[PDB]
């Protein structure tokens, strides 16, 4: 549970709510927080349009996304791709004063969106960023699915090593723990049909990457079918792949409503989590397969990450966004990987339907224009309160969930009881209106940049310092820490 101490600037409505009162008074433009303290922040040249966060050592990388739209060709988007667009390199050697140092604006890094990852492996420091909108059928070379691969041995000055062109649109990338492979998801155009897969790129030689192939899911009957994974995480020894899956070509993963719909009938589906045996690739077997070991239905289509809670292996999975009551993370016990089981769920008060109905300025029932001219309630013109990524503090020794909830800001969750996750803290960064990459009312995500902000990035926990790193669309890159009281309570070590 969350205790309010003198340090805090707590939420003024329901848990996770941005109240219309605060929007009108201007209060919503300033931060809210409990259980945490801001260490440092940079608005990254006041740019806006921030999305993904990756890191190598003491350097953060923050991608950008264009208002022109998720799938719009980069060649048609020059008005939205000039500086300060691109992946910003941020010096965090002093976390009280993070400092943006340069912009990567190569084919993959100019509009990386969700398609960026970095890894510090033994003797290999790598940053990759890809053209999230690239490779859509019928376009030319300029608009292909480019992947820019950087040697980040000097993390403050990543050196472009090569640019590889995928044979399909790649949505998210995950570099293997040894830094020598990149796993790229294909969700488009298959989407709900499940006709996509997981691409593998060998980047042992960063200057000369070698395409491995497009993988489907292989079942015990020996047959392979497509799937459309959104993102994968990878086990420590690379022998397990944990896929968050939107759909299967076998058709047994139900697909639901648009996560950007404002209201309000059909629901968003959670999608499934697949655990995949990746031993074939690890051991260099010919005709390699990715074999289905187990499946957690409703496990979460958007992101899944590994966790170890009191010595017991778990996964944390979630869908994303969604109109009220939105979407939220689920805790999945994988002690038996052949039979994963959802053991707990973490939800805010704003993820309860009854609550969402109670705050509306007008009840759906009273709306004569309902089918005729659908108009969202004013409470739905702020931004979704639902997951967008769902990380943990330490995969190998997990206590805390670090859960971005988009307009709900970043939620800090005690996971020590996996059947009963509870909030212990949160940070909402306020607002930063009129930025170059998020201004002009041209946004497409439903985030209202005039009055609030949205946290959409992966979240880092640094055990040495206790610092938590995250990026928010308009306010930029933040470093926060737990307050002394909460830290003492969690019995985290102390330095």
């Amino acid at each position: 549970q969350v205790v309010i101490g003198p340090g805090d600037r707590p939420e003024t409505g329901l848990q996770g709510q941005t109240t219309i009162e605060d929007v009108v008074s201007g209060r919503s433009k300033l931060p809210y927080h409990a259980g945490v303290r801001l260490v440092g922040r940079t608005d990254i040249w006041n740019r806006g349009g921030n999305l993904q966060l990756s890191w190598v050592d003491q350097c953060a990388y923050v991608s950008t996304f264009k208002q022109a739209g998720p799938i719009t060709a980069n060649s048609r988007s020059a008005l939205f791709l000039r500086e300060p667009a691109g992946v910003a390199v941020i010096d965090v050697r002093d976390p009280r004063a993070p400092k943006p140092v340069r912009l990567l604006r190569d084919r993959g890094s100019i509009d990386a969106v969700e398609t960026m990852h970095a890894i510090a492996a033994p003797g290999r420091k790598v940053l990759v960023a890809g053209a999230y909108s690239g490779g859509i059928a019928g376009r030319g070379e300029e608009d292909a699915a480019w992947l820019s691969i950087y040697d980040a041995s000097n993390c403050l000055n990543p050196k472009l090593q090569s640019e590889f062109k995928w044979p399909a649109n790649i949505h998210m990338v995950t570099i293997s723990p040894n830094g020598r492979r990149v796993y790229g998801t294909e969700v488009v155009p298959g989407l709900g049909s499940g006709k996509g897969g997981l691409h593998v790129l060998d980047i042992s030689d960063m200057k000369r990457p070698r395409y491995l192939g497009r993988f489907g899911v292989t079942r015990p009957n020996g047959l392979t079918a497509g799937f459309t994974p959104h993102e994968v995480s990878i086990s420590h020894d690379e022998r397990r792949i944990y896929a968050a899956v939107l759909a299967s070509e076998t058709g047994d993963v139900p697909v639901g409503a648009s996560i950007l719909a404002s209201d309000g009938d059909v629901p968003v589906e959670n999608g499934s989590v697949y655990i995949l045996d990746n031993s074939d690739i690890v051991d260099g077997r010919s005709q390699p397969k990715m074999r289905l070991v187990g499946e957690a239905k409703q496990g979460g289509f958007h992101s899944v990450v590994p966790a170890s809670i009191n010595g017991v292996p778990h996964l944390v999975g979630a869908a994303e966004l969604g109109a009220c009551p939105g979407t939220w993370p689920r805790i999945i016990n994988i002690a038996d990987e052949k039979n994963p089981k959802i053991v707990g769920e973490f939800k805010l008060q704003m993820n309860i339907k009854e609550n969402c109905d109670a705050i509306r300025f007008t009840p759906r029932k009273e709306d004569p224009y309902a089918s005729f001219i659908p108009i969202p309630d004013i409470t739905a013109r702020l931004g979704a309160v639902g997951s967008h990524f769902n990380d943990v503090d330490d995969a190998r020794n997990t206590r805390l969930g670090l859960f971005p909830f988009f307009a709900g800001g970043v939620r800090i969750v005690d996971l020590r009881d996996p059947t009963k996750p509870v909030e212990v803290g949160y940070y909402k960064p306020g607002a930063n209106p009129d930025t170059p990459l998020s201004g002009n009312g041209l946004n497409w995500t439903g985030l209202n940049d005039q009055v609030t902000d949205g946290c959409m990035s992966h979240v880092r926990y640094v055990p040495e310092s206790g610092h938590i790193w995250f990026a928010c669309v308009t306010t930029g890159f933040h470093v926060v820490e737990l307050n002394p009281d909460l830290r003492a309570r969690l019995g985290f070590p102390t330095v």
Copy 2:
């Protein structure tokens, strides 16, 4: 066609288009115009949220609408109804410097939206404003459909005479030419079912108004059926009512997509225009009926106004807004009122489907999320280019259509050939971001107040001066005039 000459600041893209290049460069925040010049303007305490324009003599009345939403109870919306919300009284005695003088904030005027009209009749000047959102079933008395009635004998200081409670939601009001009756449309909750009607209120004593009843449409078969008129206009002798009609209970009238749908294929349908014989009410017959004289299919559901073009009686009707390719006015010949005939259409290039397609950043066929996660093209994030009201310069001697096109600004159209209306001028006011009534990204109309403005009001032409009055959502009240060149070519007096 628009002669672009000195003093003009032309549109840069297709006719009616707000170009993404201009949004990004900031050019969209400044006015565009051809054929006209600005005489004067007031931003009305820089308030935003303006909608309807009415007038008496040298005073303008401008309504507001709240961000809380079209049908949200006023009692639940106090955060959106603080000053400067309300009907603003504007002194236009000096058109070069119109001045906001007063704010009317009674039950009907606090949030009037489209529901406001004023008339200057012999021995009577009257302004009425009604709670557009009032009278939804299951609410308290404070949230009823109130109509505030003002004696505007002194147009700068309208005096509240009474507040009348309609027995249903009333959407638009039209005062009769003699100033003695108010015609109020009921479109909610019936909407597409056609189950509504036309309410009539006697206001000959403004302090003691008397309800005359709710009327349907009576046909030759002797039956009366409901209809949902959005707005009516009335003939000079009140014996004819021209109704813009969304739907009929007889179901003959095509009802289509949402006017506010972002990016949809399915077009907004035009609805129908009904000509109604109103002689029963005029002559004071008991159990009065409104009898269908004629019907113009596709005539326009939103607004219809009379026009006289080279001595021949016409109507100009239109639907409203809508995604590309939007909605646009139609010219209707009613020389035979029993058989109204659409004879012309005024369309902008932005009302052509193939142009709408050509400006998209991404073609529909290239979007794999098209059904799965529908997302409007960036070109659809500015505001509809489609009619919102569709007036003429002088109903009795018509030369020009004065056509608000929302994000398209106000279009000035040569109607002298009713089969071939042609544009001769326009004014787009630019942008006025961060107003208290239109700011904070809380709009529901689809208007992007950060980079453009929306023209939604009725439009006044003053024959004596040549001045044209209109209101825009964020930029406020404007007075413009035709160029000397335009006036001469069109054959206007001097």
